Point group: C3
Chain length 109, copies 3
Protein backbone atom coordinates (compact mmCIF):
# COMPACT_ATOMS: atom_id res chain seq x y z
CA UNK A 1 0.00 0.00 0.00
CA UNK A 2 1.12 3.58 -0.81
CA UNK A 3 -0.59 6.60 0.73
CA UNK A 4 0.92 9.99 -0.16
CA UNK A 5 -1.88 12.50 -0.10
CA UNK A 6 -1.19 15.82 -1.86
CA UNK A 7 -4.26 17.90 -1.04
CA UNK A 8 -3.74 21.23 0.68
CA UNK A 9 -6.20 23.58 2.29
CA UNK A 10 -6.00 27.28 3.19
CA UNK A 11 -3.96 27.68 6.37
CA UNK A 12 -2.15 24.35 6.24
CA UNK A 13 1.37 24.29 7.75
CA UNK A 14 3.84 21.56 7.06
CA UNK A 15 7.08 19.91 6.12
CA UNK A 16 6.94 18.57 2.57
CA UNK A 17 9.23 16.30 0.59
CA UNK A 18 9.07 16.40 -3.23
CA UNK A 19 8.55 12.62 -3.37
CA UNK A 20 5.19 13.25 -1.71
CA UNK A 21 5.61 12.29 1.98
CA UNK A 22 4.85 15.08 4.43
CA UNK A 23 3.99 16.23 7.92
CA UNK A 24 0.92 18.45 7.81
CA UNK A 25 -1.06 20.55 10.26
CA UNK A 26 -4.60 21.28 9.01
CA UNK A 27 -7.94 22.51 10.22
CA UNK A 28 -9.70 21.11 13.33
CA UNK A 29 -6.42 20.65 15.20
CA UNK A 30 -5.17 17.77 13.04
CA UNK A 31 -1.58 16.68 12.57
CA UNK A 32 -1.16 14.12 9.79
CA UNK A 33 2.11 12.41 8.93
CA UNK A 34 2.10 10.36 5.69
CA UNK A 35 5.25 8.45 4.70
CA UNK A 36 6.81 5.05 4.15
CA UNK A 37 8.66 4.81 7.45
CA UNK A 38 8.80 6.85 10.67
CA UNK A 39 11.93 6.50 12.81
CA UNK A 40 12.09 8.19 16.21
CA UNK A 41 15.46 8.35 18.04
CA UNK A 42 14.89 9.88 21.47
CA UNK A 43 17.90 9.63 23.73
CA UNK A 44 15.90 9.91 26.95
CA UNK A 45 12.15 9.26 26.47
CA UNK A 46 9.01 9.55 24.43
CA UNK A 47 5.71 10.56 26.05
CA UNK A 48 2.39 10.26 24.31
CA UNK A 49 -0.19 12.24 26.26
CA UNK A 50 -3.60 11.50 24.88
CA UNK A 51 -6.80 9.78 26.04
CA UNK A 52 -6.51 7.10 23.33
CA UNK A 53 -3.65 5.81 21.21
CA UNK A 54 -4.50 3.20 18.54
CA UNK A 55 -2.02 1.10 16.56
CA UNK A 56 -3.69 -0.49 13.54
CA UNK A 57 -0.97 -3.14 13.07
CA UNK A 58 1.35 -5.28 15.15
CA UNK A 59 3.36 -3.89 18.08
CA UNK A 60 6.70 -5.20 19.24
CA UNK A 61 8.21 -4.11 22.57
CA UNK A 62 11.87 -5.14 22.91
CA UNK A 63 12.17 -4.57 26.68
CA UNK A 64 9.41 -4.55 29.31
CA UNK A 65 5.77 -3.55 29.50
CA UNK A 66 3.91 -2.01 32.38
CA UNK A 67 0.15 -1.35 32.36
CA UNK A 68 -1.61 0.50 35.22
CA UNK A 69 -5.22 0.03 34.12
CA UNK A 70 -7.11 -3.12 33.04
CA UNK A 71 -6.02 -5.08 29.97
CA UNK A 72 -8.41 -6.87 27.61
CA UNK A 73 -6.97 -9.39 25.17
CA UNK A 74 -9.43 -10.57 22.49
CA UNK A 75 -7.26 -13.50 21.37
CA UNK A 76 -5.09 -15.95 23.24
CA UNK A 77 -2.00 -14.81 25.11
CA UNK A 78 1.16 -16.95 25.54
CA UNK A 79 3.76 -16.63 28.35
CA UNK A 80 6.31 -18.84 30.04
CA UNK A 81 4.58 -18.11 33.37
CA UNK A 82 1.96 -15.77 34.76
CA UNK A 83 2.37 -14.80 38.40
CA UNK A 84 -1.19 -14.25 39.51
CA UNK A 85 -1.71 -12.64 42.92
CA UNK A 86 1.82 -13.87 43.87
CA UNK A 87 1.13 -17.43 42.61
CA UNK A 88 2.86 -19.15 39.69
CA UNK A 89 0.22 -20.32 37.25
CA UNK A 90 2.73 -22.80 35.77
CA UNK A 91 3.30 -24.52 39.14
CA UNK A 92 0.14 -23.85 41.10
CA UNK A 93 -1.66 -26.46 43.10
CA UNK A 94 -4.97 -26.82 44.98
CA UNK A 95 -6.29 -28.46 48.14
CA UNK A 96 -7.90 -31.56 46.62
CA UNK A 97 -11.36 -33.01 47.29
CA UNK A 98 -9.95 -35.42 49.90
CA UNK A 99 -8.08 -32.72 51.83
CA UNK A 100 -4.65 -33.42 50.40
CA UNK A 101 -2.88 -31.43 47.73
CA UNK A 102 -3.05 -31.76 44.00
CA UNK A 103 -0.04 -31.81 41.75
CA UNK A 104 0.98 -28.76 39.69
CA UNK A 105 -0.76 -27.38 36.58
CA UNK A 106 -0.83 -30.00 33.84
CA UNK A 107 -1.49 -30.14 30.16
CA UNK A 108 -5.13 -30.38 29.17
CA UNK A 109 -6.78 -33.84 28.66
Amino acid sequence: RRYRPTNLEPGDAGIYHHEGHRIRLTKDGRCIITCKTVEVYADESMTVDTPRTTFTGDVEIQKGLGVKGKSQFDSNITAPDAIINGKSTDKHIHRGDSGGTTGPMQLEH
Copy 2:
Protein backbone atom coordinates in the same frame (compact mmCIF):
# COMPACT_ATOMS: atom_id res chain seq x y z
CA GLY B 1 15.62 30.23 18.96
CA ASP B 2 12.94 27.56 18.49
CA ALA B 3 12.15 25.91 15.19
CA GLY B 4 8.62 24.78 14.45
CA ILE B 5 5.52 24.70 12.30
CA TYR B 6 2.38 26.48 13.53
CA HIS B 7 -1.25 26.42 12.54
CA HIS B 8 -3.47 29.45 13.14
CA GLU B 9 -5.86 27.38 15.29
CA GLY B 10 -3.15 26.85 17.83
CA HIS B 11 -1.73 23.41 17.15
CA ARG B 12 2.01 23.21 16.48
CA ILE B 13 5.20 21.17 16.28
CA ARG B 14 8.17 22.78 18.04
CA LEU B 15 11.80 22.01 18.66
CA THR B 16 13.08 23.81 21.72
CA LYS B 17 15.95 24.02 24.15
CA ASP B 18 17.40 20.88 25.81
CA GLY B 19 16.62 18.54 22.95
CA ARG B 20 12.87 18.75 23.17
CA CYS B 21 10.57 17.90 20.29
CA ILE B 22 6.98 18.83 21.13
CA ILE B 23 3.80 18.07 19.12
CA THR B 24 0.61 19.65 20.49
CA CYS B 25 -2.69 19.17 18.71
CA LYS B 26 -6.19 17.70 18.90
CA THR B 27 -5.48 14.53 16.92
CA VAL B 28 -2.25 13.03 15.61
CA GLU B 29 -2.50 10.54 12.74
CA VAL B 30 0.64 8.77 11.63
CA TYR B 31 0.35 6.80 8.39
CA ALA B 32 3.51 4.80 7.66
CA ASP B 33 3.01 2.33 4.87
CA GLU B 34 5.86 0.07 6.03
CA SER B 35 6.70 0.65 9.70
CA MET B 36 7.34 2.89 12.64
CA THR B 37 10.32 2.38 14.89
CA VAL B 38 10.71 4.15 18.22
CA ASP B 39 14.23 3.88 19.61
CA THR B 40 14.08 5.27 23.14
CA PRO B 41 14.69 3.82 26.61
CA ARG B 42 11.16 4.52 27.77
CA THR B 43 7.88 5.30 26.04
CA THR B 44 4.97 6.35 28.21
CA PHE B 45 1.30 6.59 27.15
CA THR B 46 -0.78 8.60 29.57
CA GLY B 47 -4.15 7.21 28.38
CA ASP B 48 -5.53 3.96 26.90
CA VAL B 49 -3.81 2.01 24.16
CA GLU B 50 -5.55 -0.15 21.56
CA ILE B 51 -3.60 -2.58 19.34
CA GLN B 52 -5.60 -3.90 16.41
CA LYS B 53 -3.36 -6.77 15.44
CA GLY B 54 -0.83 -8.62 17.66
CA LEU B 55 1.48 -7.72 20.50
CA GLY B 56 4.93 -9.17 21.25
CA VAL B 57 6.91 -8.27 24.40
CA LYS B 58 10.48 -9.55 24.90
CA GLY B 59 10.90 -8.42 28.53
CA LYS B 60 8.76 -8.86 31.63
CA SER B 61 5.25 -7.48 31.78
CA GLN B 62 3.67 -6.03 34.95
CA PHE B 63 -0.10 -5.52 34.92
CA ASP B 64 -1.31 -3.56 37.94
CA SER B 65 -4.98 -4.30 37.25
CA ASN B 66 -6.77 -7.43 36.10
CA ILE B 67 -6.19 -8.84 32.63
CA THR B 68 -8.82 -10.74 30.64
CA ALA B 69 -8.29 -13.16 27.75
CA PRO B 70 -10.07 -16.13 26.12
CA ASP B 71 -7.06 -18.30 27.05
CA ALA B 72 -3.52 -18.01 28.34
CA ILE B 73 -1.13 -20.65 27.13
CA ILE B 74 1.31 -20.89 30.03
CA ASN B 75 4.50 -22.91 29.48
CA GLY B 76 2.63 -24.74 26.67
CA LYS B 77 -0.48 -25.46 28.79
CA SER B 78 -3.93 -24.04 28.22
CA THR B 79 -5.06 -22.23 31.37
CA ASP B 80 -8.75 -22.53 30.33
CA LYS B 81 -8.47 -26.36 30.02
CA HIS B 82 -5.74 -27.27 32.50
CA ILE B 83 -6.00 -30.09 34.98
CA HIS B 84 -3.96 -31.47 37.91
CA ARG B 85 -3.01 -34.84 39.31
CA GLY B 86 -5.69 -35.01 42.08
CA ASP B 87 -4.98 -35.63 45.78
CA SER B 88 -5.91 -39.33 45.46
CA GLY B 89 -3.68 -40.00 42.40
CA GLY B 90 -6.34 -39.58 39.72
CA THR B 91 -6.95 -36.46 37.63
CA THR B 92 -9.02 -33.42 38.28
CA GLY B 93 -11.43 -31.86 35.81
CA PRO B 94 -10.55 -28.68 33.90
CA MET B 95 -10.39 -25.15 35.35
CA GLN B 96 -13.82 -24.12 36.65
CA LEU B 97 -15.45 -20.94 37.81
CA GLU B 98 -14.60 -19.78 41.32
CA HIS B 99 -17.03 -20.70 44.17
Copy 3:
Protein backbone atom coordinates in the same frame (compact mmCIF):
# COMPACT_ATOMS: atom_id res chain seq x y z
CA UNK C 1 20.61 3.88 21.00
CA UNK C 2 21.20 2.67 17.41
CA UNK C 3 24.05 4.87 16.15
CA UNK C 4 26.32 4.84 13.04
CA UNK C 5 23.47 5.81 10.75
CA UNK C 6 23.44 8.34 7.87
CA UNK C 7 22.58 11.82 9.25
CA UNK C 8 24.11 14.24 6.68
CA UNK C 9 21.68 16.45 4.74
CA UNK C 10 20.83 15.25 1.23
CA UNK C 11 19.49 17.16 -1.75
CA UNK C 12 15.74 17.42 -1.42
CA UNK C 13 15.61 17.10 2.39
CA UNK C 14 12.85 19.07 4.13
CA UNK C 15 12.71 19.59 7.87
CA UNK C 16 12.92 21.71 10.97
CA UNK C 17 16.30 21.82 12.73
CA UNK C 18 17.25 23.22 16.12
CA UNK C 19 20.62 24.86 16.74
CA UNK C 20 21.40 22.19 19.40
CA UNK C 21 21.16 19.59 16.64
CA UNK C 22 17.83 17.86 17.22
CA UNK C 23 15.59 17.75 14.16
CA UNK C 24 12.63 16.44 12.22
CA UNK C 25 13.76 15.48 8.74
CA UNK C 26 12.04 14.11 5.67
CA UNK C 27 14.51 12.50 3.29
CA UNK C 28 14.58 10.33 0.19
CA UNK C 29 12.66 7.11 -0.21
CA UNK C 30 9.69 8.10 1.89
CA UNK C 31 11.54 8.47 5.20
CA UNK C 32 10.63 10.57 8.20
CA UNK C 33 13.21 10.77 10.99
CA UNK C 34 12.79 12.49 14.37
CA UNK C 35 16.05 12.79 16.35
CA UNK C 36 16.04 14.39 19.82
CA UNK C 37 16.42 13.94 23.59
CA UNK C 38 12.73 13.89 24.45
CA UNK C 39 9.64 13.60 22.35
CA UNK C 40 6.41 14.96 23.92
CA UNK C 41 3.26 14.33 21.96
CA UNK C 42 0.05 15.81 23.26
CA UNK C 43 -3.19 15.06 21.44
CA UNK C 44 -6.25 16.43 23.20
CA UNK C 45 -8.49 13.74 21.67
CA UNK C 46 -6.48 10.84 20.17
CA UNK C 47 -3.45 9.51 18.37
CA UNK C 48 -3.71 6.89 15.63
CA UNK C 49 -0.68 5.02 14.21
CA UNK C 50 -1.68 3.30 10.99
CA UNK C 51 1.26 1.09 10.11
CA UNK C 52 1.73 -2.66 9.70
CA UNK C 53 4.34 -2.80 12.50
CA UNK C 54 5.41 -0.49 15.29
CA UNK C 55 8.55 -1.37 17.24
CA UNK C 56 9.66 0.09 20.59
CA UNK C 57 13.30 -0.67 21.40
CA UNK C 58 12.93 0.09 25.12
CA UNK C 59 10.32 -0.19 27.90
CA UNK C 60 6.71 0.85 27.45
CA UNK C 61 4.45 2.13 30.23
CA UNK C 62 0.72 2.50 29.71
CA UNK C 63 -0.96 4.61 32.41
CA UNK C 64 -4.56 3.59 31.70
CA UNK C 65 -5.95 0.52 29.92
CA UNK C 66 -4.64 -1.77 27.16
CA UNK C 67 -6.72 -3.60 24.57
CA UNK C 68 -5.30 -6.05 22.02
CA UNK C 69 -7.37 -7.61 19.25
CA UNK C 70 -4.86 -10.16 17.93
CA UNK C 71 -2.67 -12.72 19.75
CA UNK C 72 -0.10 -11.62 22.29
CA UNK C 73 3.22 -13.35 22.84
CA UNK C 74 5.08 -12.57 26.07
CA UNK C 75 8.64 -13.98 26.05
CA UNK C 76 9.19 -13.40 29.77
CA UNK C 77 6.91 -13.76 32.80
CA UNK C 78 3.87 -11.60 33.21
CA UNK C 79 2.41 -10.57 36.59
CA UNK C 80 -1.15 -9.54 37.39
CA UNK C 81 -3.45 -9.41 40.40
CA UNK C 82 -5.84 -11.68 38.45
CA UNK C 83 -6.39 -13.03 34.96
CA UNK C 84 -9.98 -13.62 33.94
CA UNK C 85 -9.62 -16.54 31.56
CA UNK C 86 -12.64 -17.46 29.47
CA UNK C 87 -14.77 -15.78 32.13
CA UNK C 88 -13.09 -17.51 35.09
CA UNK C 89 -10.87 -15.93 37.76
CA UNK C 90 -7.44 -17.60 37.72
CA UNK C 91 -6.80 -16.41 41.28
CA UNK C 92 -9.95 -18.11 42.60
CA UNK C 93 -10.42 -21.03 40.19
CA UNK C 94 -11.23 -24.59 41.27
CA UNK C 95 -11.58 -27.99 39.64
CA UNK C 96 -13.70 -31.06 39.98
CA UNK C 97 -11.44 -33.28 42.16
CA UNK C 98 -10.36 -36.82 41.46
CA UNK C 99 -12.83 -38.31 43.95
CA UNK C 100 -16.17 -36.82 42.90
CA UNK C 101 -15.83 -33.61 44.95
CA UNK C 102 -14.34 -30.18 44.26
CA UNK C 103 -10.88 -28.76 44.94
CA UNK C 104 -10.14 -25.50 46.77
CA UNK C 105 -8.92 -22.36 44.95
CA UNK C 106 -5.55 -21.82 43.28
CA UNK C 107 -2.68 -21.99 45.79
CA UNK C 108 0.93 -21.04 45.79
CA UNK C 109 3.29 -23.57 44.25
CA UNK C 110 5.25 -25.96 46.45
